[PDB]
Structure formats: C-alpha cells, structure tokens
Design a protein around this nucleic acid. Structure first.
Lengths: 93, 211, 50, 55, 50, 100, 117
RNA sequence: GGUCCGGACACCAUGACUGACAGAUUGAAAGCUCUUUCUCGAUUUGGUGGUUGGUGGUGCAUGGCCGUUCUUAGUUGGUG
C-alpha cells in the first residue's frame, strides 16, 4: 500500500515504543485511537506487512487485530529507526 | 462515568465475554482453562486460569506483560489500571476446556481418533470425575460424515443440577478433509470442600447420619 | 428550505447554459442527469433533460 | 475525487449503521441495553454475559 | 529531466529563474508553477494564476 | 451526614454476605446504622429465536439477568468507613459510597 | 574523509533530511549545509547548473568524480549481510538539510570545505 | 453504469512513481480518461511465484446450532 514515509515513521515508532499494537478491523476509520496522524487502514497494512515478514506476531478476535513485536522485529525496527541498542520496548523492560 | 446500573452490568458482561474469547484464542497452546474478572472501580484484576502458568507468563513474565498492555489498549483502560495474574488450575483432568484442547492437539498431531478419545476418557476418569462423554463428529472416515461417542461412568442430562455438576467444552479441528467438532462433558464429583466439584450434593441423594 | 444540493445547482446551471447556447428555431441540447429527485423549477422550463 | 467519493454515503442510521460486535453482521441485531450482538452471537455469548435460562 | 528547464545561467555565472515561482504561504521558492497556455498552475498547491 | 452505601450484584448470596458484613462492622463500631433497604430487583429479558436460520417450529429462548440493589444509610463522619468498607469485599458485588 | 561524509549522511537520511529535483528545492530554502556533486554528469548544462545555485546561496559543495559512489553514500542499497553494495543508483547531486553523525568529523568537514573556500 | 486496489511477502526488471487548476469529458466538483505541465520523490510501477477477498457453488463434503421423529416413557452395559 502507498503510505508516506513519515506515517510509516510514526507507526514504527509507536510499535517499537510499546511492544504491542491494536487496531480495529475498520478500513474506513481515518484516525487510529492510539497512534496519531495515521489512519486505521495504514496502521493495519503496515503491521500486516510486518506479520508477513515475520517481524510481528498477529492475532485476531472480535474485529480487532492484536500485534506483538518479536525478536526479528526488535532487531529490524531498531536498525530501521536508528535508535541506540540500549533503548528497548516497554514489554521487555 | 455516569452510566446506569443496567448498562454497567451489560458492559461488564460484554467485557468478560470478549476477554474470555481473546484469551481462548491466544493461550490455547498454554493450556488455557478460563478467566475471572474482578473489575474493582480502582483497578481491574483479571485472573487467567491455565494449566501451565510457566508458558502463560513466559520468560521473566514477558508474555503476561504484553497481554496486559494489549488488553489495556484494546479496552481503553489507563496504564496500570488493568492487571493480569496467572493462576494454576488445580485438577486439569476435571477441566473440560483443557481436555478439549488436549484432544484438539492430539488430533492435529495425527493420533488415531479412537486412541486419542480413549486416552482422554481414561485420564479424565482417573482424575476422579463421575462420568465423561467425548463426542468427535465430522469426516473421520471417508466422504460421509459420522459422529463417534465415547462414554464412561454416569452422566446427568436434565434438570438444574446439570448447571452445577456438568462442565462442557466444544472445539474445532481443521484437517485436510474439513472441520471436525470435539465436545467434552465432565460430571464433577461431589466435593464437600468445594474444590474438585460442587459443594452441595445432588438434590435426590439423601445421605443418612449413621447412628 | 432544507436546501438544494450542489449537484442540483450544477444541473440547473447546465440546463440554463444549454438553453442559452441554442437558437429559438432549434431545440436546446439534451442534458443527461441521474437526479430524479430534482424539483422542476422555472429555470428548467424549456430545456431538454435525459 | 477518491477522497470525497470512497465513503461519501452517510451511515448514521438504518441497518447499515450497525453490526454485531463479533461477526460484523447487520441482520437480527440486539440493541437492547447496548448489547450490539446479533441474535446468533448472543445465544453463544449469553452465559458469559450473565444471562440465564430461568423459565 | 525538465528540472534544468526552469533556470537560465547568465554568461557571467549567476542564474535567473525561467518559471514564475509560487507565492503560497507554505510553499515558496523552489516549487515552480506550470507554464500553461493561459494560466499558471502551482503543482504543490492549487494557486492558479491567470 | 448521611453516607449512602449502594451495593449491587447479580447474585443474592454474595450481596447479602457483604451487606451483613458491613452491618456487623458498623454495629461493632457503634454507629447509627440503617438496615439494608432492598430496592426492587431489575430483570433484563432477551427473548430470541433459537434457530440460526428461519426453519423449523418457532421456538424461543427466554434469557434473563437479575440485578439486586441494597442501600445502607450511615451517620459516620469518622474514618470508620474506610475500615468497614475496606475489610469486607467479595467478587461479583460492586459497592459505592455517596455523601448524601 | 569519505567515511566521515557517509556517517554524516546516514543520520540525515534517518532524520528524513537527506535529499536533483529535491536538491534544488533544498538550497532554495538555504537549509542546505552542503551538496555532493559528480564529475561523471555527462549533461554539460546540468553540471554548471547545480554549482551556480550552490555558490549563489552560499552553500559550498564537495565534488566526487563518479556518481555510483555517491549512490552508495546513502544506505539506499541492499546488502549481503556484510554491507555489500548491491544495485546502487546514480546520485549526481544531494543535499544535507540537517546535520548527522560523526560530530567530531562533522566538525572537521565544516572547517575543511569552508577553510579551503 | 462508473471508480479504487484495500494484489501481503519474495524474486527479476526498468526520476520508479503518486497527486491535482483550467478546457474537453462524465449522471457527477471523477485528474475516470484526453488536451497541459506542474508537483511529492522509493511507498511505488511491470512481470513471475505466491497470497488476499468473495451474501460465488456445493447443507448430498462438513463443524456448531436448531427442528423433527417423540412431549410420549422410553433406553443401555457388567456378570449370570
């Protein structure tokens, strides 16, 4: 999907910071409840790409995607986002 | 917030149902058994009854922390307001859901239907249940569907005592040919201490104080 | 009173333009529309609508 | 363009403005007390919600 | 590679913009407006100037 | 002042247990306690068709949830409230305090 | 000094400031600190074009003969688990809106390219 | 009738590719397309694998649920 690099930036930042990400299966919604700026469609598609690349673990229940950051994801996101190796997601802390 | 008590009760029920479904879909491999919600106005405690708390918690309790974060974000709680606690179910053999998932795993692995069903039946019976019924239905042999029932002990069907003594669970298994339904019913034993079963005896079981 | 919508106003403008760009001897060019809920106002009288 | 045409049509009322919270279906929806469950969703979830078949 | 088409390098060495630059509050120098037959269209914005 | 204790539950036994515990606490602290006032129970009924299709005899499932509400009036300006309210607690019962 | 330039460019690229088409709009805002050019740009009218604007707005530049190396000087190529430069693209020109890594070397290259100009 | 890909990921490719004033066009303020030349700039675009979605077929391939046989008193081991 065509997504601005800035929007992907915010999505990845939030995902790495929290360790998890939740999104309702609602393509039309223009505002994610937690991540600001980006739309539900962009959040869903970005994390679906992560899941396809096995960087995240996906679960679905009652019209709600839950996503868990994995170790492949923790490496990829840190290298992509250019953070120090000391920073770690809240879940690992 | 200002919400009628009727709507508060219904919201609590909806929350519990969704939480149960999500945990059932997630910790099925971890031997999930059930969930209890003590939604105190200050903090929402959620007890996850599973057979193996080790896997539920994960390495240094990371999986439970992830689940707490996900629940908070999904249900719009406040950071730290909702807390998850793992719990070890006492008798796995008397928990129908756990045995249903065990049968699911055996059938997925490829154990013969009869062998797996009889193994589960024997284990549940040795665990102390008065009776057990295991039904596996679907495309077990050939294109035509069939249902195979396994019964041992005694089992009640009609009346209120069912709600107290009978514990059921239903699951699906998707094999090459199609879906197969597993149903497990366990009649718990009469436990005066109220741990392995109901505290009150069957209404028709008159017990005599010997002189 | 609730107000005609922008599509309806555009249709009125189109029909008026077609009527203007047409001699009295001949007929105005047909204007095709999906708007079956449009009110027939004097502005439209004379024009040809599909 | 696409921005003002993809979901132009309002969905503020009617059967299309609601859905069962589990299957996203518009048919046979229970709105009493804000359940927002279909007649089939509710039969499965009633015990968990706290409804019982007394009489 | 029409980027070079909106710049005239004077023989001495300095440059002069060959296209009317935009004047929108947000987009300014750099972004150029199309050399349309009768109008000039900002690309980053609307800002049509006839 | 009149402290209002509203205890609501979907099960009578835990609700009455908690109510008795609060009453006993107040009496032990020698407070002016107003007996448990029983509000009329609220019955929420959903009647649905059992079938997931339109076929068969028309049979209906009658589900109902009951809500019981208890009122306790206390004349206690001291922090004996904090104690009596904190000690007694039970799952399935929600209690709330109001400064009427 | 190539390593220092690459390190500086990496942080700018991560910060979304590293930028032809875009490079012009960068120095029209005078947010460019410097630009890297190539002598392999066959287009004669192209080469002189970029130097003038960089000079006009007071944004001195660094010249690196061949383009393919500047393509490597972005991190925009995919690697064989060893930083192996694979499938690079021409980078005839570039701009650095915001500063990057190699703070010490970044300090050096600011003096370097300004001291000799 | 018309629009959008909301065709993940992998691989090979070749300013890749988005978007919008105005005229035309259209039921349409739909940059859908054509005139026009502007603008973001690796996300895209083309192809090959693979997915994804489907209130499409099959209830005579199935699960679950319901109805009915059947609201009647009916049913089954163990050891003999």
């Amino acid at each position: 999907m065509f997504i601005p690099k800035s929007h992907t930036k915010l999505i990845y930042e939030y995902l790495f910071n929290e360790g998890v990400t939740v999104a309702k299966k609602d393509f039309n919604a223009k505002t994610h409840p937690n991540i600001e700026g980006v739309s539900n469609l962009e959040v869903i598609k970005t994390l679906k790409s992560l899941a396809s690349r096995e960087l995240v673990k996906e679960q679905f229940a009652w019209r709600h995607y839950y996503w868990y950051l994995t170790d492949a994801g923790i490496l990829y996101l840190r290298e992509y986002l250019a953070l120090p190796a000391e920073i770690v997601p809240a879940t690992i802390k | 917030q200002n919400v009628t008590k009727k709507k508060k009760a219904v919201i609590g029920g909806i929350f519990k149902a969704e939480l149960n479904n999500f945990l059932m879909k997630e910790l099925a491999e971890d031997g999930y058994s059930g969930v209890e919600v003590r939604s105190t106005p200050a903090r929402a405690e959620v007890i996850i009854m599973a057979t193996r708390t080790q896997n539920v918690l994960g390495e240094r309790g990371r999986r439970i922390k992830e689940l707490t974060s996900v629940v908070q974000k999904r249900f719009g709680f406040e950071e730290g307001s909702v807390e998850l606690y793992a719990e070890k179910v006492s008798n796995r053999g008397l928990c129908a859901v756990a045995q249903c998932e065990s049968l699911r795993y055996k059938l997925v692995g490829g154990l013969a239907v009869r062998r797996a069903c009889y193994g589960v039946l024997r284990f549940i019976m040795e665990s102390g249940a008065q009776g057990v019924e295991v039904i596996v239905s679907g495309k077990l042999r050939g294109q035509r569907a069939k249902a195979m029932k396994f019964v041992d002990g005694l089992m009640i069907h009609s009346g209120h005592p069912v709600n107290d003594y009978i514990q059921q669970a239903v699951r699906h298994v998707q094999l090459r040919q199609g879906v197969i339904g597993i149903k497990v019913k366990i009649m718990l034993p009469y436990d005066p201490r109220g741990q392995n079963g109901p505290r009150n005896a069957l209404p028709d079981h008159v017990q005599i104080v010997e002189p | 009173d609730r107000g005609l919508k922008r599509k309806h106003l555009a249709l009125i403008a189109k029909v008026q333009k077609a009527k203007k760009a047409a001699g009295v001897l001949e007929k105005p060019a047909t204007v095709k529309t999906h708007l079956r809920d449009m009110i027939i106002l004097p502005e439209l009288v004379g024009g040809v609508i599909g | 363009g696409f921005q003002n045409l993809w979901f132009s049509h309002p969905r503020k009322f009617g059967p299309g403005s609601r859905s069962c919270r589990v299957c996203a279906g518009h048919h046979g929806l229970i709105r009493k007390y804000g359940l927002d469950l279909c007649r089939r969703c509710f039969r499965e979830q009633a015990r968990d919600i706290g409804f019982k078949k007394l009489d | 590679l029409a980027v070079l088409k909106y710049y005239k390098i004077d023989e001495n060495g300095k440059i002069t913009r060959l296209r009317k630059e935009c004047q929108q509050p947000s987009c300014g120098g750099g972004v150029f407006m199309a050399q349309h037959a009768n109008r000039h269209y900002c690309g980053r914005c609307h800002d049509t100037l006839v | 002042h009149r402290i209002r204790l509203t205890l609501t539950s979907q099960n009578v036994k835990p609700l009455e247990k908690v109510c008795a515990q609060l009453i006993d606490g107040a009496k032990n602290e020698h407070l002016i306690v107003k007996g448990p006032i029983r509000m009329p129970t609220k019955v929420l009924r959903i009647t649905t068709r059992k079938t997931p299709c339109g076929e068969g005899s028309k049979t209906w499932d009658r589900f109902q949830m009951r809500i019981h509400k208890r009122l306790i009036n206390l004349h206690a300006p001291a922090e004996v409230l904090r104690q009596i309210t904190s000690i007694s607690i039970e799952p399935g019962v929600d209690i709330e305090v109001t400064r009427a | 000094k190539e390593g220092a330039l690459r390190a500086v460019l990496r942080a700018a690229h991560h910060a979304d400031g590293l930028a032809l088409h875009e490079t012009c709009k960068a120095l029209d805002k005078r947010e460019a600190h410097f630009c890297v050019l190539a002598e392999n740009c066959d287009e004669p009218q192209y080469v002189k074009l970029v130097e003038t604007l960089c000079a006009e707005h007071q944004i001195p530049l660094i010249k690196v003969a061949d383009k393919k190396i500047i393509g490597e000087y972005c991190g925009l190529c995919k690697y064989d688990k060893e930083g192996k430069a694979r499938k690079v693209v021409g980078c005839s020109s570039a701009v650095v809106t915001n500063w990057g890594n190699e703070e010490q070397g970044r300090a050096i290259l600011t003096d370097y390219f300004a001291s000799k100009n």
